[PDB]
Amino acid sequence: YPIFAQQNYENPREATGRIVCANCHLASKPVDIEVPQAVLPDTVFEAVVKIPYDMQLKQVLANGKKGALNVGAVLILPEGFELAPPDRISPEMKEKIGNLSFQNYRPNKKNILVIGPVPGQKYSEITFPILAPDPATNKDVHFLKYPIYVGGNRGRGQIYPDGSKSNNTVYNATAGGIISKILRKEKGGYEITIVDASNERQVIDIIPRGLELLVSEGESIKLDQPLTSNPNVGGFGQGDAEIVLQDPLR
Ligand code: HEM
Numbered sequence: 744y745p746i747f748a749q750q751n752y753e754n755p756r757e758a759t760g761r762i763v764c765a766n767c768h769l770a771s772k773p774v775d776i777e778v779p780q781a782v783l784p785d786t787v788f789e790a791v792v793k794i795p796y797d798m799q800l801k802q803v804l805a806n807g808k809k810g811a812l813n814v815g816a817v818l819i820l821p822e823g824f825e826l827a828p829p830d831r832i833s834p835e836m837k838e839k840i841g842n843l844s845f846q847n848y849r850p851n852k853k854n855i856l857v858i859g860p861v862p863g864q865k866y867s868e869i870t871f872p873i874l875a876p877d878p879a880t881n882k883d884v885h886f887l888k889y890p891i892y893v894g895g896n897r898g899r900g901q902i903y904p905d906g907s908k909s910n911n912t913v914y915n916a917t918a919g920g921i922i923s924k925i926l927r928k929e930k931g932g933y934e935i936t937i938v939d940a941s942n943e944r945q946v947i948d949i950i951p952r953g954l955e956l957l958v959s960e961g962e963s964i965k966l967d968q969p970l971t972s973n974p975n976v977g978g979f980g981q982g983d984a985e986i987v988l989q990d991p992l993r
Contacts (some may be wrong), residue, residue, distance in 0.1 A: 745815050745857035747777045747904050749848055753754040755817045755855065755894065762817065762894030764979050767902040769912070772796065772978025774816075774895035782988035784877035787827045789836070790984075792816050792990050794870045794895035796977070802898050803911050807931055807952035812977055814866050815859020816895040817848065823876035823884045825853045832872050863897055875988060888981055898977015910951040913973040918946040919966040922958055935970060 745764075748755050752763045770926050778793040792845035801809035824847050829837075845868075848855035856871060878882045901912040922928045927933055932950025950956065954971040958964060 744900075745817055745846075745859055748901075749857065749938075750903055754847060754892040756819055756892060760892075760981075762783040762979075762981050763898050764817065765981075767900040768898070769850050769901045770875045770898075770975070771860040771977040772897065772920040772980050774980035774982045775895065775986050776891065778873075778891060778984045778986050779818075779944065781989040782875045783927060783991055784875055784879065787831050787836070788873050788875060788877055788986075789839075790818060790871040790873050790891060790893075792818070792871065792893055792895055792982075794863070794869070794897050794980070795867055796897045797808070798864065798867075800976045802976050803953040804899070805910065807910065809953075812898045813860035813923050814863045814869075814895065814897045815861070816857065816869060816990060817914060818856045818858075818871050820854040820856075820873065821889040822854050823872050823881055824889075825876075826856055831874060833983065836870075836872055837978050841865070843869065845871065847911035859896070867897075878988070884988070884990050888985050890985055892983045893983045894983065896977070896979045898921050898975065901975065904927075906977075906980050910953060911975055911977075913969050913975075914948070914950050914954065914969045914971045915969050916964050917948055917966070918942070918944065919964060919968070920962050924981050925956070925958070925960050928952070937964070943985040951956065 746828040748763045755763045777794040779788050782788045798906035804810040845856050847853050878884045899911040918937050920937040921940050933950040935948045954974050
């Protein structure tokens with residue numbers, strides 16, 4: 744979630760340009776961002792973010808059942824740019840945007856906006872209403888080309904803030920060996936007993952409900968080998984753009 748990033752990372756963009764969601768949302772899926780080529784001072788413009796995915800997809804939910812995907816994004820503007828207040832947004836723009844509640848990444852960070860989780864069904868495309876600053880009013884702003892960066896996600900992540908895996912990821916063998924037993928649990932999930940003859944050790948690998956098993960009793964496996972297919976149907980992607988803060992004189 745955006746909140747996880749907000750809580751654990753001071754800045755959502757790393758020195759390499761990687762956006763922090765990628766630390767937990769491990770698969771890569773496209774994202775696109777559209778903005779005008781140029782914008783005049785103190786005027787509102789739209790930053791249109793696309794986080795596309797096959798709407799027929801159903802993902803494994805926390806409970807082990809399959810369900811719909813939700814989407815979310817973090818938009819990083821230059822200092823001085825902000826979310827447009829309601830009094831500056833046209834009623835048309837208003838309805839184009841929809842019922843979205845944009846938030847500042849942190850109260851002191853007005854140039855970084857987050858949104859989500861919200862249903863992918865409705866928000867595969869999200870319009871951020873942005874208010875351009877004014878070089879005439881702000882000394883740290885100028886008539887320049889400015890970069891804009893976005894990170895957009897669809898689907899449950901693979902790792903929690905505490906570093907533990909979620910059920911939306913692949914489960915790998917914790918020991919190489921031969922599978923001596925596979926216990927199918929009543930409400931789903933399994934217990935896989937592995938005998939690592941080489942190290943003379945027995946280990947039991949637990950599989951969460953909702954994943955598809957790839958192994959059978961009597962099968963030999965290696966350490967780290969996948970015991971399940973990767974259930975993840977979602978993904979995180981990044982995009983960038985450049986906008987000219989145009990001199991009204993030109
Ligand atoms: C980065 C700013 C970031 C974004 C964007 C993001 C989005 C996001 C969405 C929209 C959801 C819901 C998905 C669904 O279909 O329901 C979601 C869920 C999870 N996230 Fe996330 N998330 C961002 C950041 C982070 C970070 C930094 C972590 C790891 C610390 C993380 C992890 C997760 C996990 C796990 C989930 C699933 C929770 C659950 O259903 O059990 N995200 N994220």
